[PDB]
Paper text:
The L-arginine biosynthesis pathway consists of eight enzymes that catalyse the conversion of L-glutamate to L-arginine, appears to be attractive target for anti-Tuberculosis (TB) drug discovery. In this work, the ligandability of four enzymes of the pathway ArgB, ArgC, ArgD and ArgF is explored using a fragment-based approach.
The first crystal structure of the ArgD holoenzyme from *M. tuberculosis* obtained ([Fig fig3]) showed that the protomer has three domains: the smaller N-terminal segment (residues 7 to 74), the relatively larger C-terminal domain (residues 286 to 396), and the central PLP-binding domain (residues 85 to 273), which is also the largest and has a Rossmann-like overall fold ([Fig fig3]). While NMR608 was the only hit validated by all techniques the fragment library contained a compound with similar structure (NMR868) that had only a melting shift of 0.9 C and therefore wasn’t selected initially for further testing. Nevertheless, The orientation of the acid group is slightly different in NMR868 and it no longer interacts directly with arg142.
Author numbering:
A (entry chain A), B (entry chain B): 7 to 397
């Protein structure tokens, strides 16, 4: 029962998440089932992680095969899956300079690695955006632009200046010859799928290049083909110095990566960084399977097509509570005219849909890339009643 | 071939580990095979991670079953494996006060969670030991007591004082009413399996309790029954305020945990910390399987028996390069009379044994808890020739 599972959670878990309102028992594709047998269409993917949904045969087969071959070894030893995964990720980034890879376990750890690279430039000043989310460990939390989540743990690693997201002249004013790096999400996810103005990431590339700062693009949530290009920044024709990845990288298996291009790729020398589980064969095998499936099933182009039809379908409802839809591909925010997103998350759950109130007035969607068109169709048709019940 | 795998590594990986000398292809139990067909007895366990060796059927069964049931969901939803794992870990700690659990992906992240708990006490001073290792993210690196790995990333989060490990008077002098927490390994692993004097951990518990400081015991390397108790600190009959775990916790799958006891368990409130992959069903299922096998096969008590036989056998060699043997259970250090541990690591490798030069003069062993005594006996019989060749 849901109450027994919730009571067990409240007896033993730290309360840093609050208590989950539902307890899930199984999942298959984009459908999850709770402990009472109710099914839900998953439009959130565990917060953009389950790019291939649950029980994807290719991920299961890769993990099962690798566990029956060779498990964890540590990076005292070279192993095939991590090397192959690094080769594939470098090919997908497609930079015209030498690109090198560091594996870790999470998005916070990937940005901690990028934080450390920044230190090796000889500079200690960092710039990030207000409301950005880059992780919750002490270094990545310093980059995260959320004072209410940072103040309790101060002092944090320095020296970080935050600027308004998308504001070209604010960024230019904050970046100088002392700036080690600028961190940016190509779309701010956790804040409410906030899309920057047209030339903004290109401006960030030019500002950082002229001042000798690294440009670090955090693709933890925007990557893995979700926006219709493998990396969201590839829509903008720029090459950052560092890119970080996690969430969907392993199809659900914990893995993150920090890629560095050109001189940045050479900063880390032996003994200066590491992670015990980083690059382990089982999680790397899972990530390799995700990449294979994205390519063989054309899921990156499918995200662009479905995201475009989903945005138009929502906008065509003409619902007075919907101000606009934003995002790209299958990362979408439904921006509301009044702050009812939390209520709409609950009434959507009543209607059998899992969504996210990312902000008081924004519903975030990040469905599996394997989502059925009819599963999206049903959500759009149900949305007016979801919103009417919310208000 | 090994040469081809090393070339592929050098073309794509960042150089933070150097280039591994061995490329592994497969593993089974405590025997691994490299890409050239050479076999090795694994006395290091991927750095204390592979508590059950490779291809353990209980871990394979748990992971395959859980992947075919429910993968990642995020902590927006309650799921059974993480709740059950938290229940089992709390039972194993055996504290008399309420204990709560936070899951994450690594030992660094576990200590980052403990660092953040320390901040919520309203104090910002931290104490750790010289030569301690607590992780490489910015917060855990501040606690790590290794200047050459810290100074390139300065400034690190404050305010940490390091004291000599095992020195009661130095610790008493460093801990005052502004000290948020003391972090200690019960045996320093990375440093060279440095065992503290009798009574030290009990003194640390008394010092911290009197001064209002948290005692955080880092059991990432000493836990999972390796020393003959589930937590190494249980040998000394103390209960810390916070315990961190990782490495062997998942039998190879990436998972870590921060356990907090009594008032420390209530410091984290909703919204103040999190990790996307934390507590996910697949890794938690793996860890549950490890705990089941430890219990069903009596591997904790077995680690004590094998560690004593191993220690006695090494001491009985009377080899002039061996100064003493230290450690507990299956975390063992061979302290040498001259700094030839790196050479001995290589000659052990020539003889088909994987060991670790943890310091210039210490060979560290952390074999799978399923290692056969016969495999240990064979290493002892080979050690005189290994050490002769080393010098």
């Amino acid at each position: 029962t849901t109450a027994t599972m919730r009571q067990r959670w409240q007896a033993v878990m730290m309360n840093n998440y609050g208590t989950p309102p539902i307890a899930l028992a199984s999942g298959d594709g984009a459908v999850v089932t709770d402990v009472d047998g109710r099914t839900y269409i998953d439009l959130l993917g565990g917060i953009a992680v389950n790019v291939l949904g649950h029980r994807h045969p290719a991920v299961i087969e890769a993990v099962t095969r690798q566990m029956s071959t060779l498990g964890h070894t540590s990076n005292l030893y070279a192993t095939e899956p991590g090397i192959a995964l690094a080769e594939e990720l470098v090919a997908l980034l497609g930079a015209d300079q030498r690109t090198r890879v560091f594996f870790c376990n999470s998005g916070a750890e990937a940005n901690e690695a990028a934080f450390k690279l920044s230190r090796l430039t000889g500079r200690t000043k960092l710039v990030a955006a207000h409301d950005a989310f880059h992780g919750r460990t002490m270094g990545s939390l310093a980059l995260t632009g959320q004072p209410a989540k940072q103040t309790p743990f101060a002092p944090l690693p320095g020296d970080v200046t935050h600027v308004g997201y998308g504001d070209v002249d604010a960024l230019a004013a904050a970046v100088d010859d002392h700036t080690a790096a600028v961190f940016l999400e190509p779309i701010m996810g956790e804040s409410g799928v906030v899309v920057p103005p047209a030339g903004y990431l290109a401006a960030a590339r030019d500002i950082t290049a002229r001042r000798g700062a690294l440009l670090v693009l955090d693709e933890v949530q925007t990557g893995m083909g979700r926006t219709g290009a493998f990396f969201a920044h590839q829509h903008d024709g720029i090459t950052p110095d560092v890119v970080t990845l996690a969430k969907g990288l392993g199809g659900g298996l914990p893995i993150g990566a920090c890629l560095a291009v050109g001189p940045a790729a050479e900063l880390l020398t032996p003994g200066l960084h590491g992670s015990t589980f980083g690059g382990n064969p089982v999680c790397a095998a899972a990530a390799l399977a995700v990449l294979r499936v994205l390519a063989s099933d054309g899921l990156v182009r499918r995200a662009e097509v479905l995201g475009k039809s989903l945005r138009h379908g929502i906008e065509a409802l003409g619902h007075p509570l919907i101000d606009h839809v934003r995002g790209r591909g299958l990362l979408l925010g439904i921006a509301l005219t009044a702050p009812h997103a939390k209520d709409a998350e609950a009434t959507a759950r009543d209607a059998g849909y899992l969504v996210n109130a990312a902000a008081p007035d924004v519903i975030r969607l990040a469905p599996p890339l394997i989502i059925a068109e009819a599963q999206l169709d049903g959500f759009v048709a149900a949305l007016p009643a979801i919103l009417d019940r919310a208000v």
